Amino acid sequence: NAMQAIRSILVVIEPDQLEGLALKRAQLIAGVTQSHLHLLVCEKRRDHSAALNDLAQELREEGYSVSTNQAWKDSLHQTIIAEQQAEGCGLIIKQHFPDNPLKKAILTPDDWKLLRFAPCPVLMTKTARPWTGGKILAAVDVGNNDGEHRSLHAGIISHAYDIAGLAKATLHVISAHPSPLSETIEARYREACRTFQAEYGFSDEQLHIEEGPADVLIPRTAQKLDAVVTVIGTVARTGLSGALIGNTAEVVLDTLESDVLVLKPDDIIAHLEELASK
Ligand SMILES: [Cl-]
Ligand SMILES: [Cl-]
Ligand SMILES: [Cl-]
């Protein structure tokens, strides 16, 4: 019940866009989990206090626990992470607004800095489709069961399952294992796969076991299922020079048309919490 355990959600509110999907997803989640909503506008110039008060009043009348703030220091991603630290939020929800209408799935450079440094789960909303009744896709690699991958996969499945339940949606899993006596090593992999299926109670129809590059297999499955949310984890160990997202998550985040919930390994979250608390 990973989502039920999140007791406050940071909702990034845009002042000038015609969609408000960050708050719509926050209302759906908190309507079930009774989580607190902290609404943040990141801007220095205009005084948004009256509009934030009116929005908070309307949500409290609907039964939500709500606080609001307007802040600005240095950059958009730094303002968001500083607010997450001040309010102790366990999830950040932000809507994706692409810089180029001909490259609509590409995240902005500031979105990438938010995903790199956030010391908590980040939900990047990329579609206006409602979650209710849709398909939720979890991305794992059943071919690896070391302590670090077991923990990360358990978190990806816990969050994806809680989302499927609160949205009255169906849950699907994509396992993309790199292409490789070949029949015997395949037995160890088939063993890992059958154990994963029993441990997590997945039907054959829910579990997509595919061989090939994860960076293209994850988006293909999301597109074929018309998934509305994809849950992914960043790489178990950082690459050189602080490259902690990893190539698979970099490509998938810039390609998916679904919303994306980005989780990080516990050891990476702990180090990012230290950096954010400086
Ligand atoms: Cl407030
Ligand atoms: Cl929704
Ligand atoms: Cl990175």
Side-chain angles (χ1 to χ4, degrees), residues 127-234:
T127 182
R129 291 177 284 145
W131 283 13
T132 298
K135 298 188 182 174
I136 314 305
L137 180 61
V140 300
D141 181 354
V142 306
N144 187 330
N145 69 337
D146 72 19
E148 304 191 10
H149 288 83
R150 287 196 307 271
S151 173
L152 186 60
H153 295 156
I156 290 162
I157 297 301
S158 183
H159 286 81
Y161 175 39
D162 295 341
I163 288 169
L166 69 86
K168 294 193 175 60
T170 54
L171 176 63
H172 312 259
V173 179
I174 176 58
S175 181
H177 190 78
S179 303
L181 187 63
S182 300
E183 185 178 4
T184 301
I185 302 175
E186 188 69 10
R188 313 182 198 276
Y189 179 76
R190 283 195 291 262
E191 177 171 318
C193 184
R194 292 302 183 185
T195 295
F196 178 90
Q197 188 170 11
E199 180 172 1
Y200 287 102
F202 290 125
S203 69
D204 295 344
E205 291 70 33
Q206 284 179 295
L207 187 54
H208 300 253
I209 304 301
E210 305 281 10
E211 179 183 330
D215 63 319
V216 303
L217 291 178
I218 293 163
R220 287 175 188 175
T221 303
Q223 185 67 237
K224 180 61 182 185
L225 293 174
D226 198 20
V228 68
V229 177
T230 303
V231 183
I232 71 173
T234 60

Side-chain angles (χ1 to χ4, degrees), residues 20-250:
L21 269 299
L23 184 56
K24 285 179 168 295
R25 306 316 195 195
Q27 286 173 284
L28 183 68
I29 296 162
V32 171
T33 70
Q34 300 189 343
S35 175
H36 178 80
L37 302 183
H38 184 70
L39 315 185
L40 170 68
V41 173
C42 302
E43 182 179 328
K44 182 179 70 177
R45 178 173 63 98
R46 295 170 297 179
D47 183 347
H48 296 293
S49 61
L52 280 169
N53 180 62
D54 288 344
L55 183 52
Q57 178 187 348
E58 289 187 17
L59 291 163
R60 295 186 185 112
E61 290 175 355
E62 292 177 6
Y64 295 97
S65 177
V66 186
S67 57
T68 68
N69 194 34
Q70 179 176 348
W72 180 269
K73 189 178 178 302
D74 295 327
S75 69
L76 178 59
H77 74 277
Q78 284 173 108
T79 301
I80 297 168
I81 293 169
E83 202 74 2
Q84 179 273 331
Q85 289 287 296
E87 296 293 334
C89 302
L91 174 65
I92 298 167
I93 307 180
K94 183 175 176 296
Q95 178 165 5
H96 168 239
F97 295 101
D99 285 336
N100 181 350
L102 293 178
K103 303 176 181 180
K104 294 181 180 299
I106 306 299
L107 303 186
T108 72
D110 193 78
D111 287 332
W112 272 113
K113 289 178 179 176
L114 173 61
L115 290 175
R116 180 167 302 111
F117 292 109
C120 62
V122 178
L123 175 61
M124 295 296 306
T125 77
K126 303 188 77 183
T127 182
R129 291 177 284 145
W131 283 13
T132 298
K135 298 188 182 174
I136 314 305
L137 180 61
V140 300
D141 181 354
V142 306
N144 187 330
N145 69 337
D146 72 19
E148 304 191 10
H149 288 83
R150 287 196 307 271
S151 173
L152 186 60
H153 295 156
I156 290 162
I157 297 301
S158 183
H159 286 81
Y161 175 39
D162 295 341
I163 288 169
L166 69 86
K168 294 193 175 60
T170 54
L171 176 63
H172 312 259
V173 179
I174 176 58
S175 181
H177 190 78
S179 303
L181 187 63
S182 300
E183 185 178 4
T184 301
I185 302 175
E186 188 69 10
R188 313 182 198 276
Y189 179 76
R190 283 195 291 262
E191 177 171 318
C193 184
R194 292 302 183 185
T195 295
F196 178 90
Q197 188 170 11
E199 180 172 1
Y200 287 102
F202 290 125
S203 69
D204 295 344
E205 291 70 33
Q206 284 179 295
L207 187 54
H208 300 253
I209 304 301
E210 305 281 10
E211 179 183 330
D215 63 319
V216 303
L217 291 178
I218 293 163
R220 287 175 188 175
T221 303
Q223 185 67 237
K224 180 61 182 185
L225 293 174
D226 198 20
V228 68
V229 177
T230 303
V231 183
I232 71 173
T234 60
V235 61
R237 296 189 174 183
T238 187
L240 301 181
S241 201
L244 67 85
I245 296 291
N247 184 70
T248 295
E250 286 180 349

